[PDB]
Write a protein that binds this ligand. Structure first.
Ligand SMILES: *[C@@H]1O[C@H](CO)[C@@H](O)[C@H](O)[C@H]1NC(C)=O
Ligand SMILES: *[C@@H]1O[C@H](CO)[C@@H](O)[C@H](O)[C@H]1NC(C)=O
Lengths: 171, 171
């Protein structure tokens, strides 16, 4: 019938910032919200970084274990800035596959977004084989909005923080 | 939005038998069904016994830690037959409280039934402090039907078996 609240699910607070060009030197649009949920096997801790999707048409699912990301570097070196992999759900591979790849590429967290037609729906992720970095899910609409901004050359930064506990049913 | 499939939830197969009087020597009505779910912290194993609710008006919640049960015995001794405590959800105490009491009274399992107005709805139970015996939840309507039969002097026996796994979301 309804198998919700079997285990605690923790929401995430997201503070998302867009680097808007051409309207004045410091201008950023930012949205603070409680959307997204930490994966069930995620470290429960904050993380922040520049959002980076997989390269190329159409590798958005990061199923291919040789999937590449184009990651910004620190001025004057080859060292990566702190970054979060932005990866679409689906494509025939697991949450653990996507989250593990993110970690192996040096990402500080993995932001999985739900697939087309699910709107703003988020679900809990099970990924006990991939626990090294923060992993959250966000909705399709928010993920798409972010991905399109990035594809249009806008840098998008996200700070993720531990949100609120939902469940389990104790009475 | 919808926090279902965070952790595997296992259904139970129930084989419930009523000892019907006055229609012939062996007559039993029995219903076999997949309803009910094992608690999240229940042993995942079969159990069988006579169903026994708490004594008295209206101790159906078994909140009182001195709650009593009237348990049938083996012919000629004081040894209890195998039995399952039939306990209503609610009353201001936890699933663990009810399940722990059942164990302390010698029950081989605890069958929690959902409260009035929930119809046939069952939810997962969290009870990590009470893991000694099989614990399941069944719906209000089935629990009420069983309780009333017992109150009307009909012995009701239940065999509980491991059912089917639902969740968690891996992709
Ligand atoms: C991934 O990135 C590098 C580019 O040199 C390479 O290892 C591999 O061939 C690339 N292509 C794909 C489709 O993953
Ligand atoms: C419970 O059962 C026995 C009956 O002698 C006793 O320990 C206790 O007073 C009883 N009453 C209630 C309401 O639990």
């Amino acid at each position: 019938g309804a198998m919700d609240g079997a285990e605690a699910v923790w929401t995430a607070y997201l503070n998302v910032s867009w680097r808007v060009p051409h309207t004045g030197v410091n201008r950023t649009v930012w949205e603070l919200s409680e959307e997204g949920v930490y994966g069930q096997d995620s470290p429960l801790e904050p993380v922040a970084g520049v959002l980076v999707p997989p390269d190329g048409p159409g590798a958005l699912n990061a199923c291919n274990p040789h999937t590449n990301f184009t990651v910004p570097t620190v001025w004057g070196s080859t060292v990566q800035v702190s970054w979060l992999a932005l990866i679409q759900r689906g494509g025939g591979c697991t949450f653990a596959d996507k989250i593990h790849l993110a970690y192996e590429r040096g990402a500080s967290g993995a932001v999985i977004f739900n697939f087309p037609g699910t709107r703003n729906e988020v679900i809990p992720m099970s990924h006990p084989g991939a626990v090294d970095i923060v992993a959250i899910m966000i909705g399709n609409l928010k993920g798409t909005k972010i991905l399109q901004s990035i594809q249009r050359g806008i840098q998008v930064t996200m700070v993720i923080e531990v949100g609120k506990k939902h469940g389990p049913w104790v009475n």
